[PDB]
Amino acid sequence: SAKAISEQTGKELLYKFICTTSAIQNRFKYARVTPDTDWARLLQDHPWLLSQNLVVKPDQLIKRRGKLGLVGVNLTLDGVKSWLKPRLGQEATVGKATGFLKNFLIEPFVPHSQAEEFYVCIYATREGDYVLFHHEGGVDVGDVDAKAQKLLVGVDEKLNPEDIKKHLLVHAPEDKKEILASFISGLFNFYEDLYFTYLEINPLVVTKDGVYVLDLAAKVDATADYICKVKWGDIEFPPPFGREAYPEEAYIADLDAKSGASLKLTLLNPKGRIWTMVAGGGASVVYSDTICDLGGVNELANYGEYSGAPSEQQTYDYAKTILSLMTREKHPDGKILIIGGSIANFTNVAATFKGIVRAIRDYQGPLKEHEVTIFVRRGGPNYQEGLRVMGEVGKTTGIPIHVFGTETHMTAIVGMALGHRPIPGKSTTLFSRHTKAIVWGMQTRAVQGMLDFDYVCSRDEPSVAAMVYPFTGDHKQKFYWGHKEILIPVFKNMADAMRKHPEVDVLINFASLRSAYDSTMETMNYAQIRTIAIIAEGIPEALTRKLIKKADQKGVTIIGPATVGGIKPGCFKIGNTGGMLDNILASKLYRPGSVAYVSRSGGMSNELNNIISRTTDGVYEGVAIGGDRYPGSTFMDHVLRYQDTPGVKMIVVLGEIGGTEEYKICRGIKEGRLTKPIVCWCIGTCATMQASETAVAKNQALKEAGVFVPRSFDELGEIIQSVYEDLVANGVIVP
Numbered sequence: 186s187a188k189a190i191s192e193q194t195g196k197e198l199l200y201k202f203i204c205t206t207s208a209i210q211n212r213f214k215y216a217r218v219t220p221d222t223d224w225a226r227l228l229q230d231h232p233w234l235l236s237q238n239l240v241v242k243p244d245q246l247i248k249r250r251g252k253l254g255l256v257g258v259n260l261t262l263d264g265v266k267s268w269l270k271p272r273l274g275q276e277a278t279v280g281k282a283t284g285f286l287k288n289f290l291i292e293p294f295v296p297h298s299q300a301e302e303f304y305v306c307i308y309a310t311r312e313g314d315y316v317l318f319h320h321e322g323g324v325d326v327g328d329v330d331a332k333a334q335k336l337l338v339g340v341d342e343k344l345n346p347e348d349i350k351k352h353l354l355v356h357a358p359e360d361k362k363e364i365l366a367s368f369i370s371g372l373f374n375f376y377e378d379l380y381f382t383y384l385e386i387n388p389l390v391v392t393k394d395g396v397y398v399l400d401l402a403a404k405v406d407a408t409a410d411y412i413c414k415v416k417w418g419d420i421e422f423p424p425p426f427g428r429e430a431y432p433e434e435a436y437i438a439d440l441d442a443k444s445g446a447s448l449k450l451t452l453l454n455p456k457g458r459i460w461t462m463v464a465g466g467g468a469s470v471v472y473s474d475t476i477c478d479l480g481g482v483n484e485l486a487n488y489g490e491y492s493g494a495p496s497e498q499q500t501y502d503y504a505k506t507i508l509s510l511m512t513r514e515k516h517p518d519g520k521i522l523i524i525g526g527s528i529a530n531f532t533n534v535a536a537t538f539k540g541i542v543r544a545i546r547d548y549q550g551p552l553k554e555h556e557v558t559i560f561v562r563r564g565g566p567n568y569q570e571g572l573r574v575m576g577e578v579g580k581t582t583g584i585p586i587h588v589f590g591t592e593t594h595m596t597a598i599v600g601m602a603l604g605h606r607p608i609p610g611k612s613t614t615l616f617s618r619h620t621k622a623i624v625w626g627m628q629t630r631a632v633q634g635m636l637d638f639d640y641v642c643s644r645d646e647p648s649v650a651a652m653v654y655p656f657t658g659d660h661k662q663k664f665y666w667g668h669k670e671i672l673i674p675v676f677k678n679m680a681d682a683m684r685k686h687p688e689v690d691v692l693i694n695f696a697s698l699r700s701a702y703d704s705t706m707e708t709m710n711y712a713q714i715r716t717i718a719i720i721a722e723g724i725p726e727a728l729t730r731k732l733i734k735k736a737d738q739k740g741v742t743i744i745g746p747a748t749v750g751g752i753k754p755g756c757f758k759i760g761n762t763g764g765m766l767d768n769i770l771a772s773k774l775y776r777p778g779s780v781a782y783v784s785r786s787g788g789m790s791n792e793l794n795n796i797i798s799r800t801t802d803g804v805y806e807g808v809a810i811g812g813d814r815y816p817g818s819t820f821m822d823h824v825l826r827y828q829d830t831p832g833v834k835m836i837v838v839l840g841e842i843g844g845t846e847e848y849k850i851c852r853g854i855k856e857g858r859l860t861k862p863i864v865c866w867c868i869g870t871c872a873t874m875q876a877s878e879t880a881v882a883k884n885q886a887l888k889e890a891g892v893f894v895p896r897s898f899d900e901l902g903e904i905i906q907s908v909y910e911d912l913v914a915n916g917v918i919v920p
């Protein structure tokens with residue numbers, strides 16, 4: 186994701202890296218101050234502080250400091266010391282946030298007139314980067330989105346200086362135009378080169394002595410560190426202004442940093458009685474939503490997750506932290522721990538649960554004393570053994586631990602735990618029975634996963650015809666088509682694989698993060714490939730925009746990045762989608778049903794497989810578009826395909842807080858483009874504890890347009906079943 190950086194960080198970056206003919210004054214003239222600052226060292230290190238008057242202000246991602254009286258202007262060093270005395274180390278409140286002011290920036294005062302303050306901003310969107318200028322900068326700039334000249338530098342296009350002069354700068358003083366345009370051009374090259382997604386300078390001051398950057402707010406695309414570490418260095422990403430982290434949050438963050446597994450923890454209410462430990466990002470949000478929906482918002486202790494297949498040791502270190510946090514003080518009503526998640530596609534549930542079980546053993550004493558009750562619900566590879574050992578440690582330690590499989594609706598355990606219930610162009614068709622795919626990368630377990638599936642589907646031929654992996658020479662890989670053993674050619678060069686298999690029209694790209702961009706661009710030089718699944722997570726947003734541009738040009742459908750893929754029962758499945766054969770059979774993914782779905786998350790997609798197979802004639806096609814800011818294909822892209830697929834009789838969409846994608850579905854129904862029944866639920870309803878982008882706003886708006894929206898995830902299965910039964914009754918669905 187994009188992440189904010191401090192003003193000092195961005196200024197430093199700008200002073201180091203910007204190439205402009207325009208004279209930029211006061212380069213590197215800034216000093217940082219905290220409660221631990223030695224004012225003697227500071228002064229020795231920054232003797233310029235004595236040269237001239239100064240400005241002092243906090244650097245903690247607080248907006249509008251001028252208006253809030255947090256900017257000391259035109260002071261001597263002594264005046265600065267005295268302005269800081271009542272403020273430094275003191276609590277301040279800004280909006281809903283309260284925290285200590287502990288980080289200040291000191292800079293030279295820059296005399297200038299109001300007319301010498303300008304406004305400039307650059308920010309990213311799917312279609313390119315907008316450059317904004319306004320000739321009246323400063324604390325009174327106002328609604329700049331409405332007032333500023335704007336220019337869009339399209340994906341993979343250049344910023345033309347003539348447009349800067351003749352459009353962006355039309356209202357600027359004529360004698361500042363040349364210097365403003367040189368600066369702006371420089372600023373944009375800098376923006377793009379260093380992988381910024383947002384960059385605001387207000388005010389940009391221009392006097393007779395040149396350009397001064399008085400203020401700067403920015404975000405960088407943090408996934409681009411593998412490219413930009415050379416320029417960024419050890420760049421820090423500050424948290425929002427607010428409370429400081431608890432040591433446990435720090436511990437887990439450090440844990441997160443040393444692994445591909447995503448490990449996240451945030452304490453909401455350390456004294457809360459409801460603790461969660463959830464596998465899957467989607468599931469993590471859904472469990473929180475559920476807890477809030479059932480009245481538990483004030484008892485919700487934490488939110489977070491442990492995803493992307495962590496190891497036993499990692500899960501143990503995670504679990505031990507939570508167990509420690511929930512035993513610092515007793516709750517008069519005892520405490521609940523929710524160990525839930527969706528149905529994993531590839532995580533080893535046995536390994537992860539063994540880690541949790543070790544932790545429970547280590548903390549059993551305080552756990553019994555604190556009257557902790559534990560609820561467990563989880564699916565995935567080896568989940569049966571995982572559930573068994575969790576039940577065992579309960580019996581063994583004397584701790585109450587109720588365990589549940591995939592027959593139990595994911596969120597049902599929250600109700601049980603709270604006592605609310607007893608404890609018991611681009612094409613329409615992407616895949617078919619004929620689909621042949623090339624798989625880029627050495628993923629033999631995944632490929633065998635696809636063959637096993639093809640086999641139980643009674644496919645005539647295997648769905649994978651060849652592999653591509655440039656890190657070795659041509660050779661053959663051995664796989665099993667049932668008990669029969671077959672060979673699959675592995676090519677060093679993509680061209681070879683393509684030419685020898687012209688019947689292939691799908692590529693599944695398992696390229697690691699550093700190869701994913703190039704291999705995908707290369708693939709789209711071969712028109713036979715109409716569909717590409719991009720698995721890798723962590724591809725920079727600006728690169729994904731280029732992939733999207735080319736795909737749109739080329740008529741190629743892209744699923745991903747950052748996705749497990751998707752599945753079309755009876756015909757084809759992408760890589761690890763759908764887990765082991767165990768889960769393929771239980772969810773009946775070996776033959777088609779009438780229900781198509783789309784979601785961002787693959788974790789929740791497997792859950793949808795489960796839910797849909799228990800409440801209907803089953804999945805017809807499911808797709809996970811992945812959770813990147815700019816997915817190669819959108820909810821609406823697939824919903825449209827589904828509308829145009831006779832075999833699809835109803836459509837399920839699991840949406841999400843953020844963005845406005847789902848409103849396209851509304852307009853689609855109101856314009857008569859979409860006519861099949863659509864079930865939708867947007868997760869993230871409690872996240873709140875622009876507004877049209879909330880899950881709540883969206884659920885309500887979709888409900889009003891004729892979309893079947895349940896009251897909560899917990900009723901999602903019910904409504905899917907109800908809409909289905911009506912479709913059977915009306916002769917639309919023939920099981």
Ligand SMILES: Nc1ncnc2c1ncn2[C@@H]1O[C@H](COP(=O)(O)OP(=O)(O)O)[C@@H](O)[C@H]1O
Pocket residue numbers: 240242247248249250251252256258292293294295296302322323324387388399400
């Ligand atoms: N170094 C400086 N020299 C002169 N004036 C300054 C300086 N820094 C800030 N100002 C004035 O203070 C105002 C607010 O400062 P700024 O850093 O933009 O904080 P914010 O936008 O958070 O209010 C600016 O619009 C500018 O007019």
Ligand SMILES: [Mg+2]
Pocket residue numbers: 323324387388400
């Ligand atoms: Mg400002």
Ligand SMILES: [Mg+2]
Pocket residue numbers: 441442443444445446447448
């Ligand atoms: Mg990680």
